[PDB]
Structure 1
């Protein structure tokens, strides 16, 4: 059914950044020009999905960081700032798998240092729709931002034995 002949690593020097095209210039240029610097600084960590045969080929990536939302009358979260899959590899479920893997990574951190949800940044409304697909709830007053509970994410990963 889904593409599963890949493995995840932190963005590294070996990984072919220039072959990656997800059909968005900004996301391509983020991976090419900014991923590694930001990962070294700790501003956002980028994880890549590599082919199991060609271990320098990038099928897709995601980026995360700690953040909080302030209630007005704090919510500790991890921000999924970016997610992308190469055009050559789209429509094979890898996007979905990366959302889950980012959930996994952030939940494991949140067990140590807190966090209750994934705050998802959607670039455009086509991507925001894609996220709604997975049960991410768009905020009304921030329309290109969604929230997805760690309870929801954990339930799914527990179900499959990824936690």
Structure 2
């Protein structure tokens, strides 16, 4: 078995090299465009590690967003930009574990500020199937953009 720690914001002492998820794009973002977007303060990246280590084994990202028309009024949302898991954890099913943490996170978020839904763009249909198996619904924004509506806590 693999035992993992609770999802936590990416630091600079986190071990990012051994992470191998299957899509080089999503392993490259973690190596390159993760720390950078965070000091810039756009997206926030949450990572999980192997127990008693700092070797990252999975991660997700979170930025705010908006929907408006071309001339309430902007609809306040939250983009789940990346969700990936290392190839050495398979049937452990740590993806659903990360999407739980993310959704719960955004729901707490929405108890601080108005947030009407989470959005995500499905890469392949397997993304879409994962994301539709867990509440996401096809939207009108884009054909691969699915939304998960947010309801107030309590």
> 2:64–2:77: 8 Å Cα contact kept in structure 1?
yes
> 1:139–1:145: 8 Å Cα contact kept in structure 2?
yes
Structure 2 alignment gaps of length 5 or more: none
Counterparts in 2 of 1:1-163, with a 5 A limit?
5-54=4-53, 56-70=54-68, 74-140=74-140, 142-151=142-151
C-alpha deviation, 1:3, in angstroms: 6.4
User: Residue by residue, what CA displacement relative to the aligned partner does 1:138-159 show, whole Å, maximum 9, x if unpaired?
Assistant: 225612111112239x6xxx8x
TM-score, normalized by length of structure 1?
0.83
Task: Provide the aligned length of Structure 1 versus Structure 2.
Answer: 151
Structure 1 alignment gaps of length 5 or more: 159-163
TM-score, normalized by length of structure 2?
0.88
Q: Which runs of 4+ in 1 moved over 4 A?
A: none
Structure having the larger proportion of residues in helix: 1
C-alpha deviation, 1:5, in angstroms: 3.6
Q: Distance in 1 between matches of 2:43 and 2:142?
A: 21
C-alpha deviation, 1:53, in angstroms: 2.2
